[PDB]
Symmetry: C3
Subunit: 282 residues, 3 copies
């Protein structure tokens, strides 16, 4: 195999170009960069600038007013690092300016996520139980995370349908995010023109095993690079509804070690009553 992490334009995919290349990427890799999806570096910088302004300049009192009473990182602020989370509703916003910027940014991401998911399902000939549009009108979670200088994040796969990741780079050039491609870890650097997409385990489940869910982690710099090593990431998880229904025997055929009686099950039956975003192979 070529272990190159490919790039696809969403616009060309939506026109039916590169079908074989895409299908083969999904099955053998499960990850790719995505251009022409409505997501520019400019916007990433509008949103990143206002949130980082809050991480740095927001009072204790202002942070408290947008902190959930249980510290789940589902909505609002969570303070060696800081996080800002959002979904389609129940959001906590520091101000009217933040809210316009972050609502627009969320929506752009949720649109791109749905749009690439529709292409994954089309490329694999997949009609989810309940149909495509009800499957994609779901329960996404957006987490933006600022990381200070000196693994960083242990290897896992995602339990999303897809995950979209926009990063800003280490000022000193270190590349933190890596994924397993062809049996070894490959760099996944920042690209101002593109978003990284990871397929998660739900893509594998829904498509009956036609899409890989790759393992990935976040590396630590060599101490020779422990100045200029901070970074941010925007991680958008497209997560199915609780009532997403799948075939139990088909789940079994593609590696899922389910303990489910009977022939069909829901996402809730499988994962339980709280979203679980990531999983270790261990």
């Amino acid at each position: 195999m070529d272990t190159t992490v490919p790039t696809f334009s969403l616009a060309e995919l939506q026109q039916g170009l590169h079908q074989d290349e895409f299908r083969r990427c999904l099955r053998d890799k499960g990850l790719f960069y995505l251009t022409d999806c409505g997501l520019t570096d400019t916007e990433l910088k509008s949103a990143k600038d206002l949130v980082i302004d809050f991480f740095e300049h927001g009072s204790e009192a202002e942070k408290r007013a947008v902190t959930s009473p249980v510290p789940t990182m589902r909505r609002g602020f969570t303070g060696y690092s800081m996080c800002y989370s959002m979904g389609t509703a129940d959001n906590l916003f520091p101000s009217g300016d933040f809210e316009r910027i972050w609502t627009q940014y969320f929506d752009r991401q949720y649109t791109a996520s749905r749009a690439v998911a529709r292409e994954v399902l089309r490329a694999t000939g997949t009609e989810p139980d309940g149909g495509v549009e009800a499957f994609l009108d779901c329960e996404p979670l957006l987490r933006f995370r600022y990381f200070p200088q000196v693994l960083r994040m242990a290897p896992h796969y995602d339990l999303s349908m897809v995950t979209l990741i926009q990063q800003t780079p280490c000022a000193n050039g270190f590349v933190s995010l890596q994924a397993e491609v062809g049996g070894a870890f490959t760099d996944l650097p920042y690209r101002p023109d593109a978003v990284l997409v990871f397929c998660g385990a739900i893509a594998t489940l829904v498509t009956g095993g036609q899409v890989k869910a790759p393992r990935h982690h976040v590396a630590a710099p060599r101490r020779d690079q422990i100045a200029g090593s901070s970074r941010t990431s925007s991680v958008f998880f497209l997560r199915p509804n609780a009532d997403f229904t799948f075939s139990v025997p088909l789940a079994r055929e593609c590696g899922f070690d389910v303990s489910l009686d009977g022939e069909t099950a829901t996402f809730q039956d499988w994962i339980g009553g709280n979203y679980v975003n990531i999983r270790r192979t261990s």
Copy 2:
């Protein structure tokens, strides 16, 4: 904010004094010391002395006779540390003397726990589904843990309604337990006259978000203090029944990242079929 960990007398709370102070503590802090609740240092020493006598002087055979066949730390003895656990029934007791002392101590703790929980629910105007008394007649767990000298315990929040903690101090004066208060970790030292109460996630859930569940951890001494660094803690978790029922949309409003179809759910639906006492934000 004043980041002082407040103290309340249960007796004054039960007389309706300090209502605003208490409500504001619950919402902004989720933790406090509690005096006048039936829990003296003297008793803590009666119970601690007999169990430590067992940790030290009980035979292998005697420990085996009060060890569960699965090592869950639910009931009896568990052997870098030792634990003694109890609930309302199915207990394992080393002897008739231990049993009287530990039954009385359990009951005192379970009484105080219920009594402070009733005040939390009253201060927030909360009527659990099924009413207050059936909610508080629940499934508590008491764990007493002896820790040897050289984190100790990673940061988490509790999934209890409330947790009551009685500690004995490090002979060398180090303060191991800390909690997040006002965005930073604050010491929670021993107080012979008071118990520490942590609100857990069930308090947040039941009250619709009026109570914080704070993160806390147990620190390690600086090696300059790795003689005289042993300690014990008595941790009493007030845990709801499996059939505790709550509103799904309300859960969502207060930060809980539930994957629950439909409008109501039970504690079992949310957490699954085994009690889970604590959780990481990660």
Copy 3:
């Protein structure tokens, strides 16, 4: 107590010999070596040789063709170590030669596992809900794991009915696997003539507390032994069906900290929708 890890011949057990010795082993230890069960070193070497030939000599492409799209270690190959997994169906085999050898080896293990489980249930007078044979016609998982040189595996107990383990030895003589026996960790070395059996938590549950589920872990060599320290293990888990049904109050009597409403429950109710193989006491 004698903290010796005992050995039983399955053939003598099946003839009703050593009943008291076996019962007392199950209750106080939960672990033993097993001879005369159809499992020779010769076979272990037929299977180990072909899989190690694949770990070393199989192409990237060949490994990919027997890698599941989600990296669960349920079936096929998983690449600091490599694993090969199998069950009763949905297997991924590198070739017709591997398949004959591994099918036969699986089946031998599944036979021995069932046969010792039947003896455990008989020795304790246990009739599972739904009867013995439907209980033992279950959902086993076989994992073969090659470990390179420099804990290795953290302490846990198994959630199996029984687990059978065949190891090959460290060329330098170090003994990696240990279990808690009589309150301390005891070596469990390779024995060409025997398999190690661990009782798991399901044995404890089904038998109403007559069998211990011991904790065990895998130790690291002293750096004085970090050449010749690689090893392999074949771990066979006998895991109940999702619909295995047990008594909730009885579960509670033997240490299980269940959050289950009502009087009976299924394995799925307790553990959820994915198999969980092992558990920490923590």
